[PDB]
Coordinates of C-alpha atoms and ligand atoms in Angstrom, one line a residue:
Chain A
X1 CA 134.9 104.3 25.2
X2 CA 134.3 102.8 28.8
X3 CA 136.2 103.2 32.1
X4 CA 135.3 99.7 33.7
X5 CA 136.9 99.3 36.9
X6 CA 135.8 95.3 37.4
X7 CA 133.1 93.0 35.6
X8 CA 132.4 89.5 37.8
X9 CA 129.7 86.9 37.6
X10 CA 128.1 86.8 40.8
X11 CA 124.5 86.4 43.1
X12 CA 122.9 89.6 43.0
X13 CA 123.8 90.2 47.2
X14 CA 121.0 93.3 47.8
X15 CA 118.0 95.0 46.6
X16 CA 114.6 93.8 45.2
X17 CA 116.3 90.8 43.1
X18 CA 119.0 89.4 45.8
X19 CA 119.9 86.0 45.2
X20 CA 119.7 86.3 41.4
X21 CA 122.5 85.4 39.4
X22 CA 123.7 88.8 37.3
X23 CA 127.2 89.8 36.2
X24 CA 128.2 93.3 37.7
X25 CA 129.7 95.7 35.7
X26 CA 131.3 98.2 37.6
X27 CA 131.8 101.5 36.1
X28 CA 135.2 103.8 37.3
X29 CA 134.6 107.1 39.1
X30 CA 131.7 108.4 40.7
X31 CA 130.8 112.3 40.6
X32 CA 129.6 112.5 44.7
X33 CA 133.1 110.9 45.5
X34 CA 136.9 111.0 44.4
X35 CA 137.0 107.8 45.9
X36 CA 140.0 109.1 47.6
X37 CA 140.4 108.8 51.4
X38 CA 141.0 111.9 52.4
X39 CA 138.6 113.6 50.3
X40 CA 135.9 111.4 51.6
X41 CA 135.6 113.7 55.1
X42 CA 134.4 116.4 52.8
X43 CA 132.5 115.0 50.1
X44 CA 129.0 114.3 48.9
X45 CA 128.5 110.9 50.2
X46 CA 130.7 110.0 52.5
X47 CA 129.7 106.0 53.5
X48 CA 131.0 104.4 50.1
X49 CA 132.5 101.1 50.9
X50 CA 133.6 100.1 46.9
X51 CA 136.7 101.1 45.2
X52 CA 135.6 102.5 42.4
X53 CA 139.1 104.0 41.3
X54 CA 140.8 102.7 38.2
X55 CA 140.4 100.0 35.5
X56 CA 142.7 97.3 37.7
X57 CA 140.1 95.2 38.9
X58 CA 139.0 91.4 37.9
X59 CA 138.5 92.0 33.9
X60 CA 138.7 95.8 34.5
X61 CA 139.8 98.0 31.8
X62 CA 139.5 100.7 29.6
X63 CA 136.8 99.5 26.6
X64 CA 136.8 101.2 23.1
X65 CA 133.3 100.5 22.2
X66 CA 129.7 98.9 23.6
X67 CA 130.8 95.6 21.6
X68 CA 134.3 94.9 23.4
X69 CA 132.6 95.7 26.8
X70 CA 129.7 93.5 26.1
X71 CA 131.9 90.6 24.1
X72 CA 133.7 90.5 28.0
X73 CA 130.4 90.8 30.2
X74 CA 128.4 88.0 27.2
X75 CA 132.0 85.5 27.9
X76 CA 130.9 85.6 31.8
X77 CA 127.7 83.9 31.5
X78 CA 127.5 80.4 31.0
X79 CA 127.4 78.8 27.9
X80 CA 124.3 77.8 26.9
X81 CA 122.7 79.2 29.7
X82 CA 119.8 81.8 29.1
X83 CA 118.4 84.3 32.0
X84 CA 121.5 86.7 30.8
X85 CA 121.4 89.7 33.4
X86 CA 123.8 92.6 33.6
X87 CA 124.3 94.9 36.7
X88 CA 125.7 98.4 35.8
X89 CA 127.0 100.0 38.9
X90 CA 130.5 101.8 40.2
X91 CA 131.0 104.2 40.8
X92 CA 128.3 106.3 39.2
X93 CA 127.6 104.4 36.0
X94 CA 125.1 107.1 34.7
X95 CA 128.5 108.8 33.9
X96 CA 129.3 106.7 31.2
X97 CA 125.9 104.5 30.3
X98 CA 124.7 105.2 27.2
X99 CA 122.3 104.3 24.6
X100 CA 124.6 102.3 22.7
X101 CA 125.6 100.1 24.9
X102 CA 122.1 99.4 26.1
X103 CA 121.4 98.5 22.7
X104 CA 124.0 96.4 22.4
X105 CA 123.7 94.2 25.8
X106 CA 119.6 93.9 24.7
X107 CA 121.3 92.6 21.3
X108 CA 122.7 89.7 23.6
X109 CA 119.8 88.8 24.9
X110 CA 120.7 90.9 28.4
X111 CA 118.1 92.1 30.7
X112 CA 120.1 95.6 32.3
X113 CA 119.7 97.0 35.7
X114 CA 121.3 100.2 37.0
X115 CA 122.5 101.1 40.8
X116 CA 122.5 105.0 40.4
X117 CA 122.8 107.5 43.3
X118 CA 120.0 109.4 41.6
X119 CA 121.4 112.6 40.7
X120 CA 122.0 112.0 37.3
X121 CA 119.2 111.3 34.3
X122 CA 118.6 108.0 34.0
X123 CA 118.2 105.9 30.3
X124 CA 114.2 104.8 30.2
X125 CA 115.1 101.9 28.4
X126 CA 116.9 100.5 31.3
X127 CA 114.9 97.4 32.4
X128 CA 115.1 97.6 35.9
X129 CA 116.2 100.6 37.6
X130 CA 117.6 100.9 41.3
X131 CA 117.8 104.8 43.0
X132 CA 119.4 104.9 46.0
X133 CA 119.0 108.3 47.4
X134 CA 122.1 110.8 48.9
X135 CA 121.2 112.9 51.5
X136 CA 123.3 115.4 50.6
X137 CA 123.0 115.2 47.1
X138 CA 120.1 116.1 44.5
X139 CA 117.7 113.6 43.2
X140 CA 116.8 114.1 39.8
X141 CA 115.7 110.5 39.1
X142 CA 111.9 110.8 41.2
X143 CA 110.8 107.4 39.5
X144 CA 111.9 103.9 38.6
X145 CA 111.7 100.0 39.7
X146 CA 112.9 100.5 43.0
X147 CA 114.0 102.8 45.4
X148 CA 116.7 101.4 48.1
X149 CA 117.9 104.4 50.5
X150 CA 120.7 103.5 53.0
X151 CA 120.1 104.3 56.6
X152 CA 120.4 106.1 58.6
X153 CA 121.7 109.6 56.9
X154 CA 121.7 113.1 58.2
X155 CA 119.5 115.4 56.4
X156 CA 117.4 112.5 55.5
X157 CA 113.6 112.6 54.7
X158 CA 113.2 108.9 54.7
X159 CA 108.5 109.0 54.6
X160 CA 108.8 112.0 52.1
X161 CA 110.8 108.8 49.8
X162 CA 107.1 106.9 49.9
X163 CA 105.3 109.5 47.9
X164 CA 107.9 108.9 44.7
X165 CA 106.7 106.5 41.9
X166 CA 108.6 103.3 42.3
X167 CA 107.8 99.4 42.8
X168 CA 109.3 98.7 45.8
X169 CA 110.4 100.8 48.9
X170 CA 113.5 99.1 50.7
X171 CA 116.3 100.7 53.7
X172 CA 119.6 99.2 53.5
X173 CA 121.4 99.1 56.6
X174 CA 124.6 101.1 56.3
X175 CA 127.7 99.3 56.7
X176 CA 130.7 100.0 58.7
X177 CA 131.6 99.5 62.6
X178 CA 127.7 100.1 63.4
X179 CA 126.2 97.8 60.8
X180 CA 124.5 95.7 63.6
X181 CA 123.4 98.7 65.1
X182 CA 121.7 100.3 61.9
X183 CA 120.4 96.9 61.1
X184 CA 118.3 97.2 64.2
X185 CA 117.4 100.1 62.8
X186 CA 116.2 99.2 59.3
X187 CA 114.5 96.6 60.6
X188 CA 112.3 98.5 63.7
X189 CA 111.6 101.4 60.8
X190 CA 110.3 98.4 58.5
X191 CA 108.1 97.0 60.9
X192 CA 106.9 100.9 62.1
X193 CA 106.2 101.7 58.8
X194 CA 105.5 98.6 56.8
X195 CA 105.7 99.9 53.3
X196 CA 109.2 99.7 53.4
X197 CA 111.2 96.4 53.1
X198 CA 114.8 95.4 54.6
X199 CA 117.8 95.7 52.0
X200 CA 120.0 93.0 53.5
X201 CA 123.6 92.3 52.0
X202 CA 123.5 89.4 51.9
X203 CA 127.3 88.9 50.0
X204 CA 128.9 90.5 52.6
X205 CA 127.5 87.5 55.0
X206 CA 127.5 84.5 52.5
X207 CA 130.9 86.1 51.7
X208 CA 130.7 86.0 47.5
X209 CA 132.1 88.2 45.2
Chain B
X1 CA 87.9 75.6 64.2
X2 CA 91.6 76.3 64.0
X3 CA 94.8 75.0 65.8
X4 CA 97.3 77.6 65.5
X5 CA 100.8 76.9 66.9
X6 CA 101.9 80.9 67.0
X7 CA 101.1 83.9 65.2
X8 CA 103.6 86.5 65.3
X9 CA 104.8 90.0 63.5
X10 CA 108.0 90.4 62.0
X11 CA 109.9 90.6 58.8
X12 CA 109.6 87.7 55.8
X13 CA 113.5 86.4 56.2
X14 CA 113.5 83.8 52.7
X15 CA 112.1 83.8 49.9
X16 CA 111.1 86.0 47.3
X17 CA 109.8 88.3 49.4
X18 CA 112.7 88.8 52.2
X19 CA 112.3 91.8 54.0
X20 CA 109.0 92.3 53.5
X21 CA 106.5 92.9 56.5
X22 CA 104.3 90.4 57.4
X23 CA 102.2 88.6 60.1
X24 CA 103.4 85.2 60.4
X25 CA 100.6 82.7 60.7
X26 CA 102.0 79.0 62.2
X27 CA 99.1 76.4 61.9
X28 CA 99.8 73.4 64.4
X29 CA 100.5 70.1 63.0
X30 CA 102.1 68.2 59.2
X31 CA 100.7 65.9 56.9
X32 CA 104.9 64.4 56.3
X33 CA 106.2 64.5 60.2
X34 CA 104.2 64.6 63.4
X35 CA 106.6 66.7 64.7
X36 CA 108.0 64.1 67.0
X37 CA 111.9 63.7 67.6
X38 CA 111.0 59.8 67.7
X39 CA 109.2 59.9 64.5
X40 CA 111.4 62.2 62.2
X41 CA 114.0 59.3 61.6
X42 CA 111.5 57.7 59.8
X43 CA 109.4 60.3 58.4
X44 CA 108.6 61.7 55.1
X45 CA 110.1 64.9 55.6
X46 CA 112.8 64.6 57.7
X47 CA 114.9 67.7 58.0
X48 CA 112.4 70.1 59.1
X49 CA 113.5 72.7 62.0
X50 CA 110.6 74.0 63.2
X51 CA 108.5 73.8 66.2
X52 CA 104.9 73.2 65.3
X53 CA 103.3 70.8 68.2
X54 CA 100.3 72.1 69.9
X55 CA 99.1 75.4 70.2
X56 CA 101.4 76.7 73.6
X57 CA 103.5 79.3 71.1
X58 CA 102.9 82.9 71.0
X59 CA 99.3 84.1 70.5
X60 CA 98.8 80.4 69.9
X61 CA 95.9 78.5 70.5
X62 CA 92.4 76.9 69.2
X63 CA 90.7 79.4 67.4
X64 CA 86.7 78.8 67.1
X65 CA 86.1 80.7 63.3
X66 CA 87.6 82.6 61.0
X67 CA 86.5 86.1 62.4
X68 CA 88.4 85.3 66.0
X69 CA 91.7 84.3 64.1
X70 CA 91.7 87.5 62.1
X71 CA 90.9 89.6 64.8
X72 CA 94.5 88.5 66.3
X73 CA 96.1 88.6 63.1
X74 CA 94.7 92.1 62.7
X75 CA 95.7 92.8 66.2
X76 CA 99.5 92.1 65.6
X77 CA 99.3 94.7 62.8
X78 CA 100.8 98.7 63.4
X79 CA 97.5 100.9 63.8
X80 CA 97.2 103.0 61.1
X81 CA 99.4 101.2 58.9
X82 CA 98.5 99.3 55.4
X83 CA 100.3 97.1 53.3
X84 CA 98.8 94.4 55.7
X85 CA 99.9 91.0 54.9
X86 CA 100.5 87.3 56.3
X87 CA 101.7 84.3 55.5
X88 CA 100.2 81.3 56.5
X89 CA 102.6 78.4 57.4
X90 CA 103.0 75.4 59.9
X91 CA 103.2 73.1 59.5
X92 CA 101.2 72.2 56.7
X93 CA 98.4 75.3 56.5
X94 CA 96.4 73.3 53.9
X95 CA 95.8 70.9 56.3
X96 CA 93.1 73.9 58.1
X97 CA 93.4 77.0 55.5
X98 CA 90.2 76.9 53.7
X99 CA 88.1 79.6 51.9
X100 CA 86.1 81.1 54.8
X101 CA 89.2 82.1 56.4
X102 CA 91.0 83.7 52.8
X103 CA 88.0 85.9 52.8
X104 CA 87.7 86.9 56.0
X105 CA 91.1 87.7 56.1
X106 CA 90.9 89.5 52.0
X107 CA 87.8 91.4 54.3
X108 CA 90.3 92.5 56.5
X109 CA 92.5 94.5 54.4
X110 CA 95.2 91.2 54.0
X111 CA 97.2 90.1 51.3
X112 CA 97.7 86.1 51.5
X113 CA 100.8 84.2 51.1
X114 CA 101.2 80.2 51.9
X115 CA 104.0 78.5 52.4
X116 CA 102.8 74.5 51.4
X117 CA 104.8 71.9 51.0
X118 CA 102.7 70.8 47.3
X119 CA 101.6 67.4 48.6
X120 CA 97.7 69.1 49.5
X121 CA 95.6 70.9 46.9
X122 CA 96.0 74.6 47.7
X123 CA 93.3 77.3 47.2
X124 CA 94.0 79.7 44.4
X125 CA 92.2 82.6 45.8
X126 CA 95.6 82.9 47.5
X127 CA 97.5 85.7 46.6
X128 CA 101.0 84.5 47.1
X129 CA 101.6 80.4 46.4
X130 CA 105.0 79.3 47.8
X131 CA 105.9 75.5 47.3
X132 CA 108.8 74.1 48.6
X133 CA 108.6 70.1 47.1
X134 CA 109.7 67.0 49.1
X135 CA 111.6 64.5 47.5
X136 CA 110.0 61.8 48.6
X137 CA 106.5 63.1 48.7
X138 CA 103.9 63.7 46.3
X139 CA 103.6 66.9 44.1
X140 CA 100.2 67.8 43.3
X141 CA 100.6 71.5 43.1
X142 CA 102.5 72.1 40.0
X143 CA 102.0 75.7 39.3
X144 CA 102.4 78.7 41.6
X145 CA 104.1 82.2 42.2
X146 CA 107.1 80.9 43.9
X147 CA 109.2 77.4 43.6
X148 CA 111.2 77.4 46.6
X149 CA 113.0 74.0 47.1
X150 CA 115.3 72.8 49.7
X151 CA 118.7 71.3 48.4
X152 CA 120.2 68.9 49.1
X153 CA 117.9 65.9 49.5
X154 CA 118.4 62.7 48.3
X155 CA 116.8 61.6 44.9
X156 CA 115.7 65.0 43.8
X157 CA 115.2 65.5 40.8
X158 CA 116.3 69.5 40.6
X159 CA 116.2 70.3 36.9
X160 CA 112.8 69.0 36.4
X161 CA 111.3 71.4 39.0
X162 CA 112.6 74.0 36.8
X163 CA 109.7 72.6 34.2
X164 CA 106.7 73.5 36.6
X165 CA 104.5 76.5 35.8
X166 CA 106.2 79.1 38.4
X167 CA 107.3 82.8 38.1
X168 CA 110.0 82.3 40.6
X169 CA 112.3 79.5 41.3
X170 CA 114.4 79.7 44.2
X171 CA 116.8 76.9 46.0
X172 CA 117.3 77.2 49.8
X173 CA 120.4 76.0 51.9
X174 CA 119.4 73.4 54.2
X175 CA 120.1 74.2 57.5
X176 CA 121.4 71.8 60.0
X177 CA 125.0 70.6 60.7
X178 CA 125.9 71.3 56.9
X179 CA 124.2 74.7 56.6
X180 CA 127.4 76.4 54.9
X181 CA 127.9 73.9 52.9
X182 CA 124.5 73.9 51.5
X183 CA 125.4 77.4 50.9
X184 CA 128.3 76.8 48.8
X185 CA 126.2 74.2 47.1
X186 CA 123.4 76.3 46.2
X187 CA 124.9 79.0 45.2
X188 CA 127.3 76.9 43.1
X189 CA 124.0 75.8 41.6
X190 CA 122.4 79.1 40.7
X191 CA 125.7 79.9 38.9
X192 CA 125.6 77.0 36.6
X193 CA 122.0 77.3 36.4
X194 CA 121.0 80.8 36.3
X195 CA 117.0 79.9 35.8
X196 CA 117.3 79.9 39.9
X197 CA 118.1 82.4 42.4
X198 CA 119.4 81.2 45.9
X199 CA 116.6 82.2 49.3
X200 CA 118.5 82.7 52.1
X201 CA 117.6 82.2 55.4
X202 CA 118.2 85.9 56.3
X203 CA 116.5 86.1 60.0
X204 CA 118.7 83.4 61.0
X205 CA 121.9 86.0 60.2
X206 CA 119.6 88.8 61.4
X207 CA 118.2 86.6 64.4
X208 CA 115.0 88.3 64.2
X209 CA 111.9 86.2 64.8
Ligands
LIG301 C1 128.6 101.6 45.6 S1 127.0 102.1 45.1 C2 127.3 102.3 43.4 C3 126.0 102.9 42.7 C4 125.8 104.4 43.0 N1 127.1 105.1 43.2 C5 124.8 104.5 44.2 O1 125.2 105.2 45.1 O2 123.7 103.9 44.0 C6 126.1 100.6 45.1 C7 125.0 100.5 46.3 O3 125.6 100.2 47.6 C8 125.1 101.2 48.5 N2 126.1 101.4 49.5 C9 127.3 102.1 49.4 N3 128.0 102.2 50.4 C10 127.3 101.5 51.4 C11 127.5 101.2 52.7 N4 128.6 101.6 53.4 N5 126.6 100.4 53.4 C12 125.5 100.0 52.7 N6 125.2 100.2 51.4 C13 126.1 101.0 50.8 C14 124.7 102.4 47.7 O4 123.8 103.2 48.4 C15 124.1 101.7 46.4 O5 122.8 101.4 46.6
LIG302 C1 108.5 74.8 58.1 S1 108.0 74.8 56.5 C2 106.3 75.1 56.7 C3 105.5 75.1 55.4 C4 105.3 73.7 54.8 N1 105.2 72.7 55.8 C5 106.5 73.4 53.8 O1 107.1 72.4 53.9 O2 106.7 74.3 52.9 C6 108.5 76.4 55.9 C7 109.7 76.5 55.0 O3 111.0 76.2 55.6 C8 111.7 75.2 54.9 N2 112.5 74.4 55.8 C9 112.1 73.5 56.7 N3 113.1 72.9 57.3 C10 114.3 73.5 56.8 C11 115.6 73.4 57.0 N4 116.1 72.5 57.9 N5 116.5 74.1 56.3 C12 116.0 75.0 55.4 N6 114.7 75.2 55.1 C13 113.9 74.5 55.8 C14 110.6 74.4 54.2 O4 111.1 73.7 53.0 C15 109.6 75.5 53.8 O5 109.9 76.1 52.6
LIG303 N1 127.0 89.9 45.4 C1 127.1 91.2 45.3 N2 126.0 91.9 45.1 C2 126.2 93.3 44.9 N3 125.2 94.1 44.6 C3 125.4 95.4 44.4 C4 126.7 95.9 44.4 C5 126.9 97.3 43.9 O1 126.1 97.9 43.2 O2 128.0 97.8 44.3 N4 127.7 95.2 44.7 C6 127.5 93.9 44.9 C7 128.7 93.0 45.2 O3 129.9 93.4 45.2 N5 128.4 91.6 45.3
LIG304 N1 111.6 86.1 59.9 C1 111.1 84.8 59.7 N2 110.8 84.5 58.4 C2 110.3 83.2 58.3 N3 109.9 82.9 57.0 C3 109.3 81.7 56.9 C4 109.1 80.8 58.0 C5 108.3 79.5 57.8 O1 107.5 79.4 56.9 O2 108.6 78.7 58.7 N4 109.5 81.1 59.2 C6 110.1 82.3 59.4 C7 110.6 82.7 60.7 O3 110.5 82.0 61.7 N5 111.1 84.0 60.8
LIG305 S1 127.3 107.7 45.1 FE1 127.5 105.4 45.2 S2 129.4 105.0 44.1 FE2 129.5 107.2 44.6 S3 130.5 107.3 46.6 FE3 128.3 107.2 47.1 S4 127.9 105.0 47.4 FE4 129.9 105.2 46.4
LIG306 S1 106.5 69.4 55.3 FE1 107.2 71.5 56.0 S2 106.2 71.7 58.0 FE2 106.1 69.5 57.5 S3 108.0 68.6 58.5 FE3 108.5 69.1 56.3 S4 109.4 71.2 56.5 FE4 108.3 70.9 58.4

């Protein structure tokens, strides 16, 4: 059984693979936030700018099985239309991704990526995997496809990210009433140390789901 | 000898690789516009917005060899940094981009990309191959790394582009009086046809050079 809290057919708006067409699945609940706003003063992460609470969102609700969840995210994609590419983010999706249902969305010819905060194991056979790192919170997950850490964050160690094994190295500019100003930021850091690569989000400027 | 328009540092803003750091190598003069207001009415490519006359930009100028242009390129470059790459553009950089100056620069420590238009033979020592096609020009590069084509022109011929030999194929807004519409347009196009994944002009939003 899966907690989904919205699945939409979008352009993939950040990371290593924006502008590529992908449906999100977004997973309910997340274990560094209620998602509440008055616990969010006091909890792990504290930036989150998704509602990640409930099933109500667009073709949100709660799935019995792998096949139901990927018979809604499969009706999405075009007909006739290969490339199939699913998102898996919330939320923490890691909290309800399993095997099964990895199985099953490779079964529909679904190439899977996963947005994960990092603290949690993550499945190998995920195809790509995204880490973006908490400050404040433990990172288990020291390897995968990419690694795209929002700036800037107390407590942060952003060089000591370099040494981990992934693909690509990218800062994210956190949003909020100083996005401008931390996209100066990203941007000087890249250019400082140019290993890293600017995490623009792009949706929230083209302004698509 | 080389006639360089500019050559400046700064972040890769479309494309595949958006975000990525990069010196940005702007070879004076086109093989499809002069670069004259009074001849783009009538020219093959018609909607270009770049400034590529003479060699009066930034670090511009006539460059004797190959060793002299690197040694600027080079310059522009953090000390102590790696991950050194540039991307040469114009202009049509295939019009002066031949092999002396791909090893001098592979000498230096440089990855290559080339943004070419596909109407010149291109060098395939060159790490990176981005064509962006013109409708009413020839295409003689029909394989590549990256398929980057502006939309909308008149009688392109989209879905056959998606036949070349290309890892990536990307369709880009064009700018101008329409540029949000474009927008819409493209990404409406990446939807129904998922093969392609929208570039976005980013430093234009970012307004970084
Ligand atoms: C909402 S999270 C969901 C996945 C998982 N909870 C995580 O943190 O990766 C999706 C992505 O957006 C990023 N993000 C969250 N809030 C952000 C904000 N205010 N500004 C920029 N990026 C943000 C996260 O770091 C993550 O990379
Ligand atoms: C200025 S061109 C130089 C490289 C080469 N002359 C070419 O045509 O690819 C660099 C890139 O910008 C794109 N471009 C030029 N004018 C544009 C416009 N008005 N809107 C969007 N992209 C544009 C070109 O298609 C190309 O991909
Ligand atoms: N276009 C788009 N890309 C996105 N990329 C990632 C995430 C996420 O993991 O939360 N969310 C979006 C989103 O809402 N829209
Ligand atoms: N940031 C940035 N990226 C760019 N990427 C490509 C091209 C080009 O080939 O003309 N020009 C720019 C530019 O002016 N700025
Ligand atoms: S870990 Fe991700 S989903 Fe959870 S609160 Fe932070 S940004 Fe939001
Ligand atoms: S071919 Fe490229 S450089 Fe030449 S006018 Fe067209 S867009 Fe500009």
């Amino acid at each position: 059984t899966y907690a989904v809290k919205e699945i939409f057919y979008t352009l993939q708006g950040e990371g290593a693979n924006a502008g590529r067409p992908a449906v999100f699945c977004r997973f309910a609940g997340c274990n560094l936030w209620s998602g509440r706003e008055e616990d969010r003063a006091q909890a792990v992460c504290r930036f989150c700018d998704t509602d990640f609470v409930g099933t109500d969102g667009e073709n949100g609700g709660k799935f019995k099985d792998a096949d139901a969840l990927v018979a809604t995210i499969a009706g999405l994609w075009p007909a006739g239309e290969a490339h199939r590419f699913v998102v898996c983010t919330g939320g923490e999706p890691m909290l309800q991704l399993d095997q099964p249902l990895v199985d099953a969305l490779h079964a529909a010819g679904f190439g899977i990526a996963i947005e994960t905060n990092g603290s949690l194991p993550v499945l190998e056979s995920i195809d790509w995997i995204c880490v973006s790192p908490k400050a404040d919170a433990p990172l288990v997950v020291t390897k995968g496809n990419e690694l795209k850490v929002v700036i800037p964050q107390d407590n942060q160690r952003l060089a000591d990210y370099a040494k981990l094994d992934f693909e690509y190295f990218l800062v994210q500019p956190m949003d909020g009433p100083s996005r401008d100003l931390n996209t100066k930021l990203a941007i000087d850091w890249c250019k400082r140390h140019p290993q890293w690569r600017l995490s623009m989000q792009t949706h929230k400027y083209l302004n698509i789901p």
